[PDB]
Each structure stands twice: as structure tokens, then as C-alpha cells.
Design an enzyme around this catalytic site. Structure first.
Site, PDB file in Angstrom:
ATOM      1  N   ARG A   1       0.809  -1.211   0.000  1.00 53.89           N
ATOM      2  CA  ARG A   1       0.000   0.000   0.000  1.00 53.89           C
ATOM      3  C   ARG A   1       0.845   1.265   0.000  1.00 53.89           C
ATOM      4  O   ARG A   1       0.380   2.306  -0.470  1.00 53.89           O
ATOM      5  CB  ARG A   1      -0.932   0.002   1.205  1.00 53.89           C
TER       6      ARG A   1
ATOM      7  N   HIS B   1      -7.132 -21.050 -18.788  1.00 52.09           N
ATOM      8  CA  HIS B   1      -8.096 -20.475 -17.857  1.00 52.09           C
ATOM      9  C   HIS B   1      -9.522 -20.889 -18.212  1.00 52.09           C
ATOM     10  O   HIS B   1     -10.000 -20.619 -19.312  1.00 52.09           O
ATOM     11  CB  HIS B   1      -7.980 -18.949 -17.841  1.00 52.09           C
TER      12      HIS B   1
ATOM     13  N   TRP C   1     -12.696   6.057   4.582  1.00 53.70           N
ATOM     14  CA  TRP C   1     -12.537   4.658   4.196  1.00 53.70           C
ATOM     15  C   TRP C   1     -12.316   3.769   5.407  1.00 53.70           C
ATOM     16  O   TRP C   1     -12.918   2.699   5.514  1.00 53.70           O
ATOM     17  CB  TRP C   1     -11.382   4.519   3.208  1.00 53.70           C
TER      18      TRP C   1
ATOM     19  N   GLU D   1     -23.504 -15.359 -13.686  1.00 55.07           N
ATOM     20  CA  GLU D   1     -22.692 -16.170 -12.793  1.00 55.07           C
ATOM     21  C   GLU D   1     -23.551 -16.943 -11.808  1.00 55.07           C
ATOM     22  O   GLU D   1     -23.126 -17.985 -11.305  1.00 55.07           O
ATOM     23  CB  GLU D   1     -21.695 -15.288 -12.044  1.00 55.07           C
TER      24      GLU D   1
ATOM     25  N   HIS E   1     -22.821 -22.057 -17.987  1.00 48.15           N
ATOM     26  CA  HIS E   1     -22.772 -20.896 -18.867  1.00 48.15           C
ATOM     27  C   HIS E   1     -23.167 -21.266 -20.282  1.00 48.15           C
ATOM     28  O   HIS E   1     -23.694 -20.426 -21.019  1.00 48.15           O
ATOM     29  CB  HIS E   1     -21.375 -20.289 -18.876  1.00 48.15           C
TER      30      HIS E   1
ATOM     31  N   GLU F   1     -18.950 -24.441 -15.652  1.00 47.52           N
ATOM     32  CA  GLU F   1     -18.726 -23.880 -16.975  1.00 47.52           C
ATOM     33  C   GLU F   1     -19.715 -24.416 -17.989  1.00 47.52           C
ATOM     34  O   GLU F   1     -19.982 -23.753 -18.993  1.00 47.52           O
ATOM     35  CB  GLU F   1     -17.303 -24.151 -17.428  1.00 47.52           C
TER      36      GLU F   1
ATOM     37  N   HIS G   1     -10.270  -4.393  -9.074  1.00 48.76           N
ATOM     38  CA  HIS G   1     -11.490  -3.875  -9.676  1.00 48.76           C
ATOM     39  C   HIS G   1     -11.597  -2.363  -9.587  1.00 48.76           C
ATOM     40  O   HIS G   1     -12.366  -1.765 -10.341  1.00 48.76           O
ATOM     41  CB  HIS G   1     -12.707  -4.523  -9.025  1.00 48.76           C
TER      42      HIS G   1
ATOM     43  N   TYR H   1     -21.186  -8.595  -7.537  1.00 50.14           N
ATOM     44  CA  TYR H   1     -20.850  -9.678  -6.628  1.00 50.14           C
ATOM     45  C   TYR H   1     -21.750  -9.728  -5.408  1.00 50.14           C
ATOM     46  O   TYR H   1     -21.815 -10.766  -4.745  1.00 50.14           O
ATOM     47  CB  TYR H   1     -19.395  -9.554  -6.180  1.00 50.14           C
TER      48      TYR H   1
END
Ligand SMILES: *[C@@H]1O[C@H](CO)[C@@H](O[C@@H]2O[C@H](CO)[C@@H](O)[C@H](O)[C@H]2NC(C)=O)[C@H](O)[C@H]1NC(C)=O
Ligand SMILES: *[C@@H]1O[C@H](CO)[C@@H](O[C@@H]2O[C@H](CO)[C@@H](O)[C@H](O)[C@H]2NC(C)=O)[C@H](O)[C@H]1NC(C)=O
Ligand SMILES: *[C@@H]1O[C@H](CO)[C@@H](O[C@@H]2O[C@H](CO)[C@@H](O)[C@H](O)[C@H]2NC(C)=O)[C@H](O)[C@H]1NC(C)=O
Ligand SMILES: *[C@@H]1O[C@H](CO)[C@@H](O[C@@H]2O[C@H](CO)[C@@H](O)[C@H](O)[C@H]2NC(C)=O)[C@H](O)[C@H]1NC(C)=O
Ligand SMILES: *[C@@H]1O[C@H](CO)[C@@H](O[C@@H]2O[C@H](CO)[C@@H](O)[C@H](O)[C@H]2NC(C)=O)[C@H](O)[C@H]1NC(C)=O
Ligand SMILES: *[C@@H]1O[C@H](CO)[C@@H](O)[C@H](O)[C@H]1NC(C)=O
EC number: 3.4.17.23
Lengths: 595, 98
Positions: A149, A325, A457, A382, A358, A355, A485, A495
Site C-alpha cells: 500500500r 483459464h 474509508w 454467474e 454458462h 462452466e 477492480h 458480486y
């Protein structure tokens, strides 16, 4: 006139499907066989798709949008008319792409060097993620947490401040109030007779659902705190917050690496079928053929028979450079391929079921027009993949698929071991996700000025999450931007809602399959009525509002947290008996340095 | 790479009469604005091409079609099925067709 817009879209729907195909076919040949004569093969074929779409976008503003009556042709027009960028001045548009490229390469190439040996230096992914996930040394986890950080996050602070100003200009030129309101436009629904949803209504539904998880999260926070005091004595207060560098990874997003310290009954092996796979000589192909028999068991179609030649289920017999992946591809024209490098393990037995989910979602809405072939919102895609993985990991399904001794006994001590491993990933990530999007929404609208970014924060960490920092951080740090992200320009509320939709789908399908026990023992195999309940949502795409899609499965028009809590009531009963002598809750005044 | 030699018509003023055929290539005019033989908004070329490729899912691969249509105007006769002939027996009361 409206009939001119219909004739506009049908020329669009037949030029796009071919140009999207070979722009995605060239991305397959790069992903499964890397040269540089394939990267140049996909950059020119990728830019012909992007240059074509801005040409049809500037043709779409010849048609007005409020002179349209059919809901389907209005939905296709609004998704194409969207200006997004390009609303800025042309020198501000290249300044924004310079910031996004600089912030992305700091995160991936930033190094941290050791103060005992400045010639050894670690990147984040090899070496710094392994310390935060495996070490039990207090002083080494504190070194890796603070130095990431202070050496990388301090470079992103002057870049993230200029990023907020340029993104708010782009959002206000598209008639939003800020960039946070631009991200909430996915959940917006306009005028479909009782199914509407406002972009400000998402903020109340997240905070209304969150205050019903806080009883369950407080008892999980108190149990983990009591187990961490045995692993780190003289470092943790029994009535305070948890230190931020002892949570299992770099940011405390998932608590899933705390399982070896917090396991309820360590003398019972958590069930693992990997040895029974290598004792029956299961090849690479058996894992998908048993996965295809799961989906045909519920009343869903077979694989498309082009699925078996074109796909690449392992890394090849060549030592072949090909990004390994797990992913599911939907190239177009009814051509579905799965790319993964599967090993004989129950881990990749489960993600094979994930998978394939999907793919079965993709095969269902392939009859809609081209601009409506996504999930109904960003969270549904998802969520349908993970209710296939929950139903396949049950011991009821494993003993009927041939992998468990027909003389196996599930005891009540192993169900607590299984449910606590789920709650460290599911429940442990929900206050982290809610706090982070709440901080980013208040930064964009201006409720937090820039002299109080790092002050607000860490006040929200102690109050919402229950996590205290080990070293004080002033306004030269930017600790949110040290996550992937935030520095790579991604939305994070997907999420939160995916976790709530996942148990709403699973509870609605188990009432149709006539389940009798707890929700966490359920399996939807051999049913047909549950699959018919699932298929009535899968074929919608984006053609209907997402609130209309939820009533086809659940029977409600909003996301609900009560199916998530019913999954964890065997754990919530056991947790309230382990915290009879403990203190439930935390104090926002204690700090690990304030003595 | 795509076989772009198989086209189809995707815009016409009015649906075809049965067994009618139309090979013209005039610029279609969707909107009210006249076209004057040049492309543009609401002025579209009327033919599209299947880009067939060997890695297409079924239902996306080319099918060849033949439509047989038997008609009966008012003539005296014409083509028909084939007539098979069997064996011939002799010196026995038989039921025959020659
Ligand atoms: C990766 O794919 C490329 C193209 O698909 C392969 O490169 C050439 O492909 C042509 C076919 O059009 C062959 O005639 C050439 O012989 C290939 N080049 C070479 C040097 O063999 C390439 O071979 C593939 N990668 C690997 C490792 O085989
Ligand atoms: C406009 O809306 C109508 C219904 O609101 C859609 O009409 C359907 O169209 C399909 C094929 O286009 C037919 O098979 C259905 O029978 C039609 N329904 C009715 C009730 O007639 C129409 O498709 C919409 N326009 C577009 C371009 O999709
Ligand atoms: C998209 O951005 C443009 C500015 O580049 C906005 O203003 C449009 O300007 C064009 C000329 O370049 C006009 O043809 C449009 O009529 C203008 N907007 C409209 C349709 O009123 C435009 O408002 C933006 N579109 C969106 C999605 O709001
Ligand atoms: C698993 O089930 C057993 C069987 O009921 C539980 O053992 C009981 O525990 C209670 C509370 O400690 C005692 O009052 C009973 O006498 C116990 N039963 C027997 C037969 O001794 C056990 O507690 C359960 N474990 C969990 C984790 O729920
Ligand atoms: C659920 O589906 C499986 C798969 O068809 C069924 O498994 C069969 O079970 C019978 C007797 O239990 C065996 O003789 C078959 O060999 C099994 N089939 C396969 C392919 O392994 C199972 O019976 C179904 N469950 C119920 C309750 O009907
Ligand atoms: C799916 O494939 C199997 C063989 O691979 C076949 O027996 C079955 O009938 C197929 N499903 C349907 C619905 O035809």
C-alpha cells in the site's frame, strides 16, 4: 417513423452476427495457440468489429427514441444509441485512456523489495499473494500488507483523483448525475406495467437486505476472532475489530484461507473424491460426459455435437502456449466451445458443472435478436453457473453418480465442517462488497471530498466490516485503488446481487423437486418440473425486464435475503451456542497501535 | 474464411406469388425519401450473403433443397412410376395381364 427502425435493425442483425463471429474466432486462435502472428491476427480483426459498431451507433441517433411503441425494438435501440465515451473533448478522451493504461500497468508490474536484501523483489501475484495466503508470522504478514500500500498505492493516488473528474464529466454529458448513477443503469427498468425499477431504488434494496445479514455476520465475526486469538496471542483484543493483515489475503475480500485455523472438528476429513476418480481410470472426457448427463437429467438439451471436436478440454499434447483459464465461449452462429485445462480432481469436476452452466444459459436465449443475447442483468450469468456447482457437490449426488461407498455415513459433525467452509467465502465477502461500493458511490457524487477519502474509508471498515488497520494512513495513500477492480475500472455491485440471486434460485428449484430436508442437502437430478421452472427464465435474455424474469422462477419481483439465511440456519444455530461466553460485536475505538 | 457466394433477398415491396421469381437488384427504399440509386439511410441494397463456415453449429450449416412439384394440366398423359414384370407360367389355368 417506427417501421423504419425495424428495417434498420434487421440490416444490423445480419452484418453484426458475421463480423462478431470472425472477431471472436480470431480471439479463439490466439487463446489456444499463442504466436505473435496470431496477436496481430486478432488486433486487426478485433478493430474491424469496434470500428463497425461506432459507425452504426452514429446512425442510430437519426431515429428518436420516444416515438417508439414496441418494447423489444425500443430495448435494442437504447443499447445501441448509447454514447458512452466520445462525449468528451478529443484531448480529454486521450487523457482518460492514458490514465487507465497507467493505473493498469502499475498494478501488474509493481514490485516490492525486501529491507534485508534490496536485490530480491516480489510482484503481487507470484510471491506477495503467497505470503498473505500461507504465512502464520505476524511480522511478515504486516510487512507485505503495508509495503504493497505504501509503494504501489501511493502511485495511484494522483492518478485516481484525475480519474474521478473525467468520469463524472462523461456521465453528466450522458444525462446522469455522476458516474455511480451510470453504473446503476444496468438495473433500471422503464415502463412495463408494474415491473419498474429506479436507479436510486438499488441503493435502498442493498441496505435493506444487508441489515438482515448483520445478525449472522456478527456471530461469524465473533467465532473467527476467538479462534484467531489462539493462532496470534498478544495481538488480538477479545472485544475489538480484527487486524486487516490477518484475514487470509491482501484485502480481506474472502476469508477462505482461514479454514485451517477455524475448522470446527479437525479430526473429521472434509469429503474429497479425488482418489476415487484415479481408481476408476476416468479420462478427461468422463468429467464432461457425467456433466452432460446431469443436465439431460433435469430436462435440458444435449451438447451441440460441434461441442466435442472444436473444444479443447485439456492443454494439448504439444507443449503449446495457450492461456489455461476455465471459460465458456459463445462465438456466434450456434457455435459453443469450452476452453479449460482439466485435471482429474473433484475441483475441476465441479467447475466443469459450473462452466457447462454458462453454455446451457447461452444455448437457451440464442433465438432472440443479437443485441439481447446477454443475461437479464449483470448478476444472473454467474448465478446460474453456481447453482449447478452446489447441486453436484452434495454427497447425495456423489453416491448416485458412482463415487461414494454405498455404505457412507454423513454425520452432523461433517455438515458443520462443510457449512463453515461455505460461510467463509459467501458470508465473509458480503460486508466487504457492500462497504466498497458504498464508498465509491459517495466519492462520485461528492459526499466525500478529497481531503477525507482515506479518513472515511477506515471509519467504514471499523463500523461495517469490523476490521481495523495496523498502521495509520493519511491522505497520501489510496487503499481502495490497490484492488484490481478499482484500478482497472470495474463495477463491484454484481458480486453482492449474485450471492442473493443464487440462493433464491436454489430454494425455488428445490420446492419444485419436492425436497424434504435442509436446503444445503438438495439436488435437482432426475426432476423435470424443476428444469421447466428454470428453462422459462433461461430463454428470455434481455428481452424482458429482469424483475419479470425473477417471478418466472422465484415468484417475487425483488431480491430477497431470506433464502440465503435458510441455507445457513444449521450453522447459525451451532454458532449461537459457541458464543455463550464470548462477546458478539466489536468496538470501533481499539487499535493495535493505540497502547 | 466464409463462402460469400450464396446470397438471399431480405427486402421486397410485397410477398411473392407462389412460384414467382425475382432476380432484380434495385436499391430498396424503406423510408419515404427517394433513393436515386445510391445507398444510405433507408436506402438499402436488397441482397445479403450467408457467410458459411465449416465450424458452424447445425442450423447454421448449408442445406441443399429440391422441391418436386407434380402438376396435371389437361394433356393426354406423361411420365409416371415404373411398371415391374414378373415371370410367365405355361400349361396352367392362370390369371394373366399382358
Ligand atoms: C498456431 O496456428 C497457426 C495458424 O493457425 C500455425 O501457423 C501456420 O499455419 C499454417 C496453416 O494455415 C501452416 O501451413 C503452417 O505450417 C503453420 N506454421 C508453422 C510454423 O508451422 C501454427 O503452426 C500454430 N502453432 C503451432 C505451435 O503449431
Ligand atoms: C412487436 O411486438 C409484437 C407483439 O407485441 C411482436 O409480434 C410477434 O412477432 C412474432 C414474430 O415477429 C410472431 O411470431 C408473434 O406471433 C407476434 N405476436 C403477436 C401477438 O402478434 C413483434 O415481433 C414485435 N416486433 C419485433 C421487431 O420484434
Ligand atoms: C450523444 O452525444 C451527442 C453529442 O455528440 C449528443 O448531442 C447530439 O448531437 C448530434 C450531432 O452530433 C445530434 O444529431 C443529436 O440530435 C444530439 N442528441 C440528440 C439526439 O438530441 C446526444 O444527445 C448524445 N446522445 C445521447 C445518448 O444522449
Ligand atoms: C450430533 O448429534 C449428536 C446426537 O444427538 C449430538 O450429541 C448430543 O449432544 C447433546 C448436547 O451436547 C447432548 O445433550 C446429548 O446427550 C448428545 N447425544 C448423545 C447420544 O450423547 C451432538 O451434539 C451433535 N453434534 C452437533 C455438532 O450438532
Ligand atoms: C437418478 O438418475 C440416475 C441416472 O439415470 C438413476 O441411476 C440408475 O439407477 C438404477 C437403480 O438405482 C441403476 O440400475 C441404473 O444403472 C442407474 N443408471 C445409471 C445411468 O447409472 C437413478 O435411479 C435416478 N434416481 C431415481 C430416484 O430414479
Ligand atoms: C442426448 O444424447 C444421448 C446420447 O449421447 C441420447 O441417447 C439422448 O436421447 C439425447 N437426448 C435427446 C433429448 O435426444
Amino acid at each position: 417513423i417506427e417501421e423504419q427502425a425495424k428495417t434498420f435493425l434487421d440490416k444490423f442483425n445480419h452484418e453484426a452476427e458475421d463480423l462478431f463471429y470472425q472477431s471472436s474466432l480470431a480471439s479463439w486462435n490466439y487463446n489456444t495457440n499463442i504466436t505473435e502472428e496470431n496477436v496481430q491476427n486478432m488486433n486487426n480483426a478485433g478493430d474491424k468489429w469496434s470500428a463497425f459498431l461506432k459507425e452504426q451507433s452514429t446512425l442510430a441517433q437519426m431515429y428518436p427514441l420516444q416515438e417508439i411503441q414496441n418494447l423489444t425494438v425500443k430495448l435494442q435501440l437504447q443499447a445501441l444509441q448509447q454514447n458512452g465515451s466520445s462525449v468528451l473533448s478529443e484531448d480529454k478522451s486521450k487523457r482518460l485512456n492514458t490514465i487507465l493504461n497507467t493505473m493498469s500497468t502499475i498494478y501488474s508490474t509493481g514490485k516490492v523489495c525486501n529491507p534485508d536484501n534490496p536485490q530480491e523483489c516480489l510482484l503481487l501475484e507470484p510471491g506477495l499473494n503467497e505470503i498473505m495466503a500461507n504465512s502464520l508470522d505476524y511480522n511478515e504478514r504486516l510487512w507485505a500488507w503495508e509495503s504493497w500500500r505504501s509503494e504501489v498505492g501511493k502511485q495511484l493516488r494522483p492518478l485516481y483523483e484525475e480519474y474521478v473528474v473525467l468520469k463524472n464529466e462523461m456521465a453528466r454529458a450522458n444525462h446522469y448525475e455522476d458516474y455511480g448513477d451510470y453504473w446503476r443503469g444496468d438495473y433500471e427498468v422503464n415502463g412495463v406495467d408494474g415491473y419498474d425499477y429506479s436507479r436510486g431504488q438499488l441503493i435502498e434494496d442493498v441496505e435493506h437486505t444487508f441489515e438482515e445479514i448483520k445478525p449472522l455476520y456478527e456471530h461469524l465475526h465473533a467465532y473467527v476472532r476467538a479462534k484467531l486469538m489462539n493462532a496470534y496471542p498478544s495481538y488480538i483484543s477479545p472485544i475489538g475489530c480484527l487486524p486487516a493483515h490477518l484475514l487470509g489475503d491482501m484485502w480481506g475480500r474472502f476469508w477462505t484461507n482461514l479454514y485451517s485455523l477455524t475448522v470446527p472438528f479437525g479430526q473429521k476429513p472434509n469429503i474429497d473424491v479425488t482418489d476415487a476418480m484415479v481408481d476408476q481410470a476416468w479420462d478427461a472426457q468422463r468429467i464432461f460426459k457425467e456433466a452432460e448427463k446431469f443436465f439431460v437429467s433435469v430436462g435440458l438439451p444435449n451438447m451441440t455435437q460441434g461441442f466435442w471436436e472444436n473444444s479443447m478440454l485439456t492443454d494439448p499434447g504439444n507443449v503449446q502456449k495457450a492461456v489455461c483459464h476455465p471459460t465458456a465461449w459463445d462465438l456466434g452462429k450456434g457455435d459453443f466451445r469450452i476452453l479449460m485445462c482439466t485435471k482429474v480432481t473433484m475441483d475441476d469436476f465441479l467447475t466443469a458443472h459450473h462452466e457447462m452452466g454458462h453454455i446451457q444459459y447461452d444455448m437457451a436465449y440464442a433465438a432472440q435478436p443479437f443485441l439481447l443475447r446477454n443475461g437479464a442483468n449483470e448478476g444472473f450469468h454467474e448465478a446460474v453457473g453456481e447453482i449447478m456447482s452446489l447441486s453436484a457437490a452434495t454427497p447425495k449426488h456423489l453416491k448416485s453418480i458412482g463415487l461414494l461407498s454405498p455404505d457412507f455415513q454423513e454425520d452432523n459433525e461433517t455438515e458443520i465442517n462443510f457449512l463453515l467452509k461455505q460461510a467463509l467465502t459467501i458470508v465473509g465477502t458480503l460486508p466487504f462488497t457492500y462497504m466498497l461500493e458504498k464508498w465509491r458511490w459517495m466519492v462520485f457524487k461528492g459526499e466525500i471530498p478529497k481531503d477525507q477519502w482515506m479518513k472515511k474509508w477506515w471509519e467504514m471498515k471499523r463500523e461495517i466490516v469490523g476490521v481495523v488497520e495496523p498502521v495509520p494512513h493519511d491522505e497520501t495513500y489510496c487503499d481502495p485503488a490497490s484492488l484490481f477492480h478499482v484500478s482497472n475500472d470495474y463495477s463491484f455491485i454484481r458480486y453482492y446481487t449474485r450471492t442473493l440471486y443464487q440462493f433464491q434460485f436454489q430454494e425455488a428449484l428445490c420446492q419444485a423437486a419436492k425436497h424434504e430436508g435442509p436446503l444445503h442437502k438438495c439436488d435437482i437430478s432426475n426432476s423435470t418440473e424443476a428444469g421447466q421452472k428454470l428453462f422459462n427464465m433461461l430463454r428470455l435474455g434481455k428481452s424482458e425486464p429482469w424483475t419479470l424474469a425473477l417471478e418466472n422462477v422465484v415468484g417475487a419481483k425483488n431480491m430477497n435475503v431470506r433464502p440465503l439465511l435458510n441455507y445457513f440456519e444449521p450453522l447459525f444455530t451451532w454458532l449461537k451456542d459457541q458464543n455463550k461466553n464470548s462477546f458478539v460485536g466489536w468496538s470501533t475505538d481499539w487499535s493495535p497501535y493505540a497502547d | 474464411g466464409g463462402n460469400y457466394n450464396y446470397l438471399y433477398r431480405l427486402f421486397r415491396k410485397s410477398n411473392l406469388k407462389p412460384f414467382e421469381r425475382d432476380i432484380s437488384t434495385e436499391i430498396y427504399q424503406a423510408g419515404s425519401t427517394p433513393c436515386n440509386g445510391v445507398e444510405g439511410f433507408n436506402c438499402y441494397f436488397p441482397l445479403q450473403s450467408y457467410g458459411f463456415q465449416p465450424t458452424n453449429g447445425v442450423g447454421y450449416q448449408p442445406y441443399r433443397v429440391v422441391v418436386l412439384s407434380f402438376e396435371l394440366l389437361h394433356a393426354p398423359a406423361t411420365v409416371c412410376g415404373p411398371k415391374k414384370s414378373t415371370n410367365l407360367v405355361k400349361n396352367k389355368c392362370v390369371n394373366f395381364n399382358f
